[PDB]
């Protein structure tokens, strides 16, 4: 019956963020979650669910593939290998001195 009665997005995202922040400090996930929950005002069990859901947050998908009726498309394998082919590494500092040889800076 309750319409859109749920937790706030900001607090949830910030909660999960603080969990990750504290995962840097504590590698024991339970230690992390159990300590943060009483600060934000939630249970470690629920906070764990938020973190787990935020894991599946990266799981983006959608059923809607273009079908190859008469124009034969190519269905690839599992191996998503490169196609563009490596350019040069580039970004190489080859310039005519970034610093001025003769001075000009009388102004600071």
What are the percentages of helix, strand and coil residues in the chain, rounded to 5?
40, 0, 60
CA dist list (Å): 1 to 5, 8, 9: 9, 19, 21
CATH of 1-66, one of 1.10.10.10, 1.20.900.10, 3.30.460.10, 3.40.640.10: 1.10.10.10
Alpha-carbon gap, residue 60 to 18, rounded angstroms: 23
Up-side HSE of residue 19: CA atoms within 13 Å toward CB? 26
């Amino acid at each position: 019956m309750t319409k859109n009665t749920r937790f706030s997005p900001e607090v949830r995202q910030r909660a999960v963020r603080m969990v990750l922040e504290s995962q840097g400090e504590y590698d024991s996930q339970w230690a992390t979650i159990c300590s943060i929950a009483p600060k934000i005002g939630c249970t470690p069990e629920t906070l764990r669910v938020w973190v787990r859901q935020h894991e599946r947050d990266t799981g983006g998908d959608d059923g809607g593939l273009t079908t190859a009726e008469r124009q034969r498309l190519k269905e690839p394998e599992r191996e998503n290998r490169e196609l563009r082919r490596s350019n040069d590494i580039l970004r190489l500092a080859s310039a005519y001195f970034a610093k001025a040889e003769f001075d000009r800076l009388w102004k600071k």
